[PDB]
Design an enzyme around this catalytic site. Sequence first.
Site, PDB file in Angstrom:
ATOM      1  N   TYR B 130       0.828  -1.194   0.000  1.00 44.92           N
ATOM      2  CA  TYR B 130       0.000   0.000   0.000  1.00 44.92           C
ATOM      3  C   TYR B 130       0.864   1.245   0.000  1.00 44.92           C
ATOM      4  O   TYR B 130       1.974   1.225   0.514  1.00 44.92           O
ATOM      5  CB  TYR B 130      -0.946   0.050   1.190  1.00 44.92           C
ATOM      6  CG  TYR B 130      -0.363  -0.105   2.568  1.00 44.92           C
ATOM      7  CD1 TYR B 130       0.067  -1.341   3.019  1.00 44.92           C
ATOM      8  CD2 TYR B 130      -0.348   0.971   3.471  1.00 44.92           C
ATOM      9  CE1 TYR B 130       0.524  -1.510   4.304  1.00 44.92           C
ATOM     10  CE2 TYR B 130       0.114   0.800   4.777  1.00 44.92           C
ATOM     11  CZ  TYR B 130       0.547  -0.436   5.175  1.00 44.92           C
ATOM     12  OH  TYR B 130       1.016  -0.613   6.453  1.00 44.92           O
ATOM     13  N   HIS B 153       8.192   3.232  16.848  1.00 42.66           N
ATOM     14  CA  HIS B 153       7.503   2.556  15.755  1.00 42.66           C
ATOM     15  C   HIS B 153       8.183   1.242  15.428  1.00 42.66           C
ATOM     16  O   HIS B 153       7.525   0.192  15.335  1.00 42.66           O
ATOM     17  CB  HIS B 153       7.453   3.547  14.570  1.00 42.66           C
ATOM     18  CG  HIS B 153       7.152   2.936  13.245  1.00 42.66           C
ATOM     19  ND1 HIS B 153       5.867   2.778  12.776  1.00 42.66           N
ATOM     20  CD2 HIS B 153       7.971   2.520  12.253  1.00 42.66           C
ATOM     21  CE1 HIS B 153       5.909   2.222  11.577  1.00 42.66           C
ATOM     22  NE2 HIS B 153       7.174   2.063  11.236  1.00 42.66           N
TER      23      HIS B 153
END
Lengths: 228, 230, 223, 230, 231
Positions: B130, B153
């Site tokens: 994506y 993250h």
Amino acid sequence: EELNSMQRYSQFAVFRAIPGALGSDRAEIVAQAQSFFDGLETAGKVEVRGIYDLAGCRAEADFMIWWIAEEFEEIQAAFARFRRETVLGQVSEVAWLGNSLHRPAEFNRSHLPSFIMGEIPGDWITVYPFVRSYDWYIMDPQKRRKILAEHGQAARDFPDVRANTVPAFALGDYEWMLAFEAPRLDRIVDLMHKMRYTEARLHVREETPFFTGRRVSEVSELVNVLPG
Amino acid sequence: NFEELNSMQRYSQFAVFRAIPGALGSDRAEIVAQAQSFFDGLETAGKVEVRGIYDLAGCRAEADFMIWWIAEEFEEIQAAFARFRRETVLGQVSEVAWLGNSLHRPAEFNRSHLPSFIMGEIPGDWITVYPFVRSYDWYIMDPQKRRKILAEHGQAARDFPDVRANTVPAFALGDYEWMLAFEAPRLDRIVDLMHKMRYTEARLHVREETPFFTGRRVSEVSELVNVLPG
Amino acid sequence: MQRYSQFAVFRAIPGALGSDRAEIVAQAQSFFDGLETAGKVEVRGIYDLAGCRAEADFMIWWIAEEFEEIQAAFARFRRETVLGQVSEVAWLGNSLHRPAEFNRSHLPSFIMGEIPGDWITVYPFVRSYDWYIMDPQKRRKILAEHGQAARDFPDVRANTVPAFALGDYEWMLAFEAPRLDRIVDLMHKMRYTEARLHVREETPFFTGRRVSEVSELVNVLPG
Amino acid sequence: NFEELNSMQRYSQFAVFRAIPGALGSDRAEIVAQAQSFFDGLETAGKVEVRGIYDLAGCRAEADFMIWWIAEEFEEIQAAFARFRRETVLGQVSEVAWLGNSLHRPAEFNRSHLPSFIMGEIPGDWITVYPFVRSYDWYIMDPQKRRKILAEHGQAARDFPDVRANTVPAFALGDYEWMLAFEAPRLDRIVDLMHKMRYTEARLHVREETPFFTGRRVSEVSELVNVLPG
Amino acid sequence: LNFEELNSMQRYSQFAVFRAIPGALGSDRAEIVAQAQSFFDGLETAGKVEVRGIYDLAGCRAEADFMIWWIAEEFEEIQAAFARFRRETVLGQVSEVAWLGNSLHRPAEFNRSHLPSFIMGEIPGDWITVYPFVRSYDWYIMDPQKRRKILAEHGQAARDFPDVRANTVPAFALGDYEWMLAFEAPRLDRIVDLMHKMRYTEARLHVREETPFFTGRRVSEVSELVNVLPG
């Protein structure tokens, strides 16, 4: 228990009819489709929970197959066979696919989708995807927990409407696949209305398209209604 | 050999196609032969490397398969992409649904973070692709703060070393800032990674992350063509 | 009184209808006459949408006690009448009549069995995320002042009906009036309300003229 | 200070076309010859200047090539655009995908900032084109604060003198406020410039900047026509 | 208060935008032209629908080619004429409806001397740009003194463009929009510059939607437009 543990993919395959492709003589089309679904069921790998008549719900959609399997490859294969090897699949267009993978809930491991609980599918259904606000998961967990408890409390006026809330991350554009099954459509409408009165509504980004329709007892009933 | 891999020039394109209903038919023998020979020709020319062909059946309406190929120059992907559409029936009977283009660059803070394809890792059996767009404030943010957010993250992905990342700049190659691809041996690992990665501060600095394309790597153009709807 | 209401908006396919429409009209009038006979689905109006928007040409407004009766009628129209076969479904606005939240006197025009308006504007509606959890007497107050804003328009009849889970929206609205300019002016004045601060979506709009019988509509179409 | 170049009137249009699959076919030499005669006919009339024709193959779904042409009067572009579609076979087998129209104007603060095409610079081998819409609050911002933001924004481009900018007003010529085009010898320098320009405060004052169109300037119509799908 | 009759007049206004269908017109268009001219002659003769302009939009945007601007006292009169164009002329039959912008003239909220060019009977402009408009949700409920101030600054901002003629017309309930906007001028560059200058107004903080834009050139006669279209 073992139901939190188990592996089940779920797909809502929404199809649209192509005017002119189906024709008027359909008995053999009916016979062939039921045979297809009969073969699926005996093969033990893909469970068809319902075929639904979506006529009149929205432009560009006509029916939906809700099917379930331990392996997504098994849904891929059934999806392809239906399209490639049934006249009904040959004459319909894929309108929207809603894919999901069952997981334990975050805070209440007694919250399980109705299809996982093995409950009888409801006569009426509404399906839609869902996307939460960007801040929802990184929110203080106990605040999210309270909001979801209040969310839950707001639903218990609708014990007759069975919920399926299933992760959909990376199976399409969405975070969750939602499906609500009930004996009467007006109870699904009233549930969605009542659930607007919750703080969780402050943490919503997407929840469309909706697909709503009637579970057919027999694929006969769907085929005979489609535009020819 | 990190500094050399970081300085390498490699473009990457995810080319997503949809099969035209009715165009393929029942007689696909020569289509497969002709398509296999196109991909054979690509290998021997030795400039465009195909990392995988993917069956996207069941992922979404309006996409059926995807080619992931990589080249030192974008003009070489342009030539391969155009040749596929123009000189093979498979490309002739398909339409282009979406193109995700990217150019490998060193990471901003952690220069040991490199795409699986740049590392020469075997491609995964399952993929999700994506595009990505950051919040408007992401890049002018104080760099120490963005650095800390990106380190958290990464840590959030600690339990998923079997999911290999490809995070690649996409500016000016389309509508997007990053092209993302995650490869794994099983699909459920990708779903579970994505869900866990929601639990990060980075999520407060996102604008766009769709469309998603998810599917299965096929070993042979044969295997894909015979899945397609006729 | 329980009623489902559907606005079924169709788009004419230029080239599909020809100008041999006489058989098509008679067949379509027969369909509608037969619906009247069966007594389940009441057609409030057929509407000429010509010139309102690209990609829409006509609209059927019909009403029934059970949604599956509307599904059956909608499906039969597309399946068994050439007019339905050569027309595309543009948009469906579905709704289910429910009593209002505060003022139980506010009933839709079609529930009161009032005469249908010559002119109609239909549109879906979605409130702000915070609307329903807003303090209740605050929402009651906003809704009352919003109603007060339509006092000068007693000739415009309202139809504000829940649409949750029957599509992508929360409410279906339909305003009926003898003159189109009264609908335009009502909408304009309704902008001067605090309620406008609690809106997320209100399109697409379908505006059109109620016709007498199918022939008057079919004869307009590009066909 | 650049009075004449700032004062001149030039409309600029990026016309993006899509190939209609099945339309062009295998017989292209005369389509090429006719298209070059249309373009030579434009040069000789002297009203419309074709700055480039671009191969966009592989950039995005539903676009294939682009004409960039410039004229003193917009009706001259309208006529050439219509004549291309009407009186050449190439125009007849192509579909308009997107049009980006603009009108040159002096910059608000730095009158030395002028489009590459206005300065008569040679067009670059690679281009990216996209529309732009600023935040609603941008133009009413106190002018000295906008000037500072734009000065800092210009400073952020200082290491990319090889990437030539064309920032051109588009108000009322479509849906946008500006038409942007960046031209350069190397595509990778355009990617890197776009990445670097994210590191400015001006990014906090943006509403829209897609679709992007990126591709390679061709030497002759033949190079383009021969790559299109038939 | 020197405009009360024009303020009270009832006139609908529609911008009907069409797209040519490649391959449908062909190259012998003389019959289609004569038929189309006849259609427009009939409207003029019937006296109900006024055609203010026909516009060549070639090169403005993908998926549009030409536009008819017509006006009538009753919306059903435009409806009929629109349907008849599509149904009864080959030009209407070989074209697709791209977009419709409908509106209904009303007196301005504050400055009652502000009336549309077409209501004032002004010569239509050689160049036009049309777009629909939607204000911020808070615009109409805002304190009137505040909206008055913002609208007064907005009109003052257009001071150097007396040659650009505005038509700002209510569109509520005639489609998806609140206003239908059309600016007419002798030179397109004047519309570009007005639009740029009009960004420097507080009113821009109260905007939600203002696309699609249709910009083009008024043609003298139907012949001129049809000859431009793709065959």
